C-alpha cells in the first residue's frame, strides 16, 4: 500500500512511499505542483518508512524491508545505508523514532519462536539496545510524547 509521509521539517517537501521511494517538492499537479527531487529503488520490498526526526542529516528514511532489515536510506554520512538486522529474519511491521531522543528507531517485527519482536535499536549490522516483547508481533508502535 502506497503511503505519503510529510517530512518533520522542510515544509515544502514530502515523500510518497511506494514500490520505489520518491521525494517530491510542493511548488504532477498537487493542487500547486509537485517536482520530483530524488528517487531511491535500492530497498525493495519496503513495508515501513519513518522520517529521521533530527535535522541533520535531512531526508533520512528508515526503510523497513520485508526481511526485517532496516535500511537508513537517504532519500553525518555515517548514518547512510545502515543495515540494522534482527536476530532472526521476519517482517518489519511498524517503525517509530522517539521524539524525545531521535536516535533510537523503535522497530516492530513479526512473530518468532524465541526472538524479541519490538526491538529498540541505536542509530549512533548492529545489536538492539533494548529488546522488549517476546514470541509476539508488534503490529504498531507509538512513542509517548510526554
Amino acid at each position: 500500500k502506497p503511503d505519503i509521509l510529510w517530512a518533520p521539517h522542510h515544509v515544502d517537501r514530502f515523500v510518497v512511499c511506494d514500490s520505489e521511494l520518491s521525494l517530491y517538492h510542493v511548488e504532477l499537479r498537487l493542487s500547486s505542483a509537485a517536482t520530483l527531487l530524488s528517487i531511491n529503488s535500492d530497498t525493495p520490498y519496503m513495508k515501513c518508512v519513518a522520517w529521521y526526526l533530527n535535522y541533520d542529516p535531512e531526508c533520512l528514511l528508515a526503510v523497513g524491508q520485508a526481511n526485517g532489515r532496516v535500511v537508513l536510506t537517504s532519500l553525518f554520512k555515517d548514518l547512510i545505508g545502515k543495515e540494522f538486522v534482527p536476530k532472526h529474519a521476519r517482517q518489519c511491521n511498524t517503525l517509530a523514532w522517539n521524539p524525545l531522543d531521535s536516535n533510537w528507531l523503535a522497530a516492530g517485527l513479526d512473530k518468532h519462536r524465541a526472538d524479541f519482536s519490538v526491538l529498540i535499536w541505536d542509530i549512533c549490522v548492529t545489536k538492539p539496545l533494548y529488546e522488549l516483547g517476546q514470541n509476539d508481533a508488534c503490529l504498531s508502535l507509538c512513542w509517548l510524547p510526554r
Binding site: N67, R69, V85, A89, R90, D110, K111, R113, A114
Partner: protein, 272 residues
Amino acid sequence: MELHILEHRVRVLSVARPGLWLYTHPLIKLLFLPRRSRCKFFSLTETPEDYTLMVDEEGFKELPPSEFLQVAEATWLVLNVSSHTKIARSVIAPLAEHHVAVLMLSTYQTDFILVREQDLSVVIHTLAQEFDIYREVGGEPVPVHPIQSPQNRFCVLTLDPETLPAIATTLIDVLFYSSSITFFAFSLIEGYISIVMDAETQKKFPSDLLLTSSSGELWRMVRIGGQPLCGIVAQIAGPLAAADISAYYISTFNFAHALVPEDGIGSVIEVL
C-alpha cells in the same frame, strides 16, 4: 504462563510415498492457493517412510480417501502456549507422566502441541496446576526406540505469503518431483509459513526469499521413535527437557523428530 486450546479439529493423515501423485491436486490447493480453500491449519512433513499431513476437518474434506492413505482414528486439538518458552518441561513431560500421547509441531513462529480430543479431560487435569487453560471459542478466549542422527544440515524457514507464488515452481519440484535422510516440513498455519528443509535444498530457492536467523545458522536432527500413531516424543522431549535443551520438534505419523542447533548436536546426542 497461559495456554490456549485453539479452534482447530485436526486429523493426522499419513500419505504413502507412492501415493503422493493422487493427492497432488488437493495438496497444491492447500499449499499454494489459500483463497481456494477454507483450511486454516496445514502441516506437511516429508519423511522417507511416508508423508505426514496435519490438516483440520475443513481441509480434510478435500482429501479423497484411497488405499494409499492412513488416517488417525481420533481428532487432535491444537494447544498453544502463550507468553502472557520451554514447553518440553511443562507440557510434554507432565502429559507423558499422565500417559497422554502428543504430536508436537513446532513452527518458525510458535510451537504447537496436539492432543487427542478423547484425552482433553486428562490434559486439563494435568496442565491446570502450571498453566491457566484457555479455549478459543468464537474468536475469543474462554476459560475452561533407538535414536538416529542423520548428517545432513537443516534450516527452519519462513516465507512472505505474497512471495510464495514467486518460488512456487521450485517448491512443487522439491515436494512432488524428487547417515543422510530426506526431510521436508511445510506448515501454513493461520497465514504463517514455516519450512524445514535440508541445506542442500536451500540452494535451489533464492536467498532473498528465505528469511531466517540473518547468519545462515543450520539445525541438526535426532529422529527417533517407531511404530505409527506418544513415547515417540516423550522418549526424547522428556530427556531433553531434563537436560534443559531447546529443540524444534516435528512429530509425524509413525516417527518423531527434534531439530537442534548444529553447535549443540553433539550434546543432544550425548544426552540420549
